[PDB]
């Protein structure tokens, strides 16, 4: 409801057959430097991976990287559900490309995807 917000969609992954794919639909508040949105992790493997989380975090600019830290769960930050997602995006300063790592919880275990490409749109 305040002026300072914009959306952005990031596709995180190598894009290789059978590789994990993370889609982040993010809201960015350029005043408080805060971020909120959704994470979806899928993989065209057998069985199908359909992981989802409400995510939140913040961004920081260092001179040129824009670093976005995210964590997530079922419901968001006011929910007391366990954190099931952590992500760190190291985007180039234009906010359109970069590298990312993340960890997600599924089937009683953590799964980590490290240093994969990031693109917007």
Residue numbers in the entry: 5 to 67, 78 to 135
Which statements did the authors publish about this structure?
The Q63NT7 protein from Burkholderia pseudomallei is 212 amino acids in length (molecular mass 22.5 kDa). It contains two predicted domains: an N-terminal domain of unknown function (14.5 kDa; DUF1842) and the C-terminal domain (DUF1843; 5.4 kDa), which tends to appear in multiple paralogous copies within individual bacterial operons. The N-terminal domain was predicted to fold into a β-barrel composed of eight antiparallel strands. Polar residues are found covering the exterior surface of the β-barrel, while the interior of the β-barrel is lined with mostly hydrophobic residues, without space for a channel through the barrel.
Q63NT7 presented a challenge for obtaining large, well ordered crystals. We also observed inconsistent crystal formation across our replicated crystal trays. Even so, we were ultimately (after approximately six months) able to optimize these conditions and grow larger rectangular-shaped crystals that diffracted beyond 3 Å resolution on a synchrotron microfocus beamline. We collected data sets from these crystals, which we refer to as form 1. Diffraction data indexing revealed the space group to be P21. The highest resolution resulted from data collected from a single crystal specimen. Efforts to phase the highest quality data set (form 1) using experimental techniques did not lead to immediate success; selenomethionine-labeled protein crystals did not diffract, and we observed no heavy-atom signal in the diffraction patterns of crystals soaked in caesium chloride or potassium iodide. Form 1 crystals gave a combined LLG value of 719, form 2 crystals gave an LLG value of 394 and form 3 crystals gave an LLG value of 305. Because the form 1 crystals gave the highest resolution diffraction data (from X-rays), a model for the β-sheet-rich domain was refined against these data and then subsequently used as the starting point for model refinements of the other crystal forms (X-ray and electron). Final refinement for the form 1 model gave an R factor of 25.1% and an R free of 28.7%. The backbone r.m.s.d. values between the experimental structures and the AlphaFold model were 0.35 Å for form 1, 0.49 Å for form 2 and 0.46 Å for form 3.
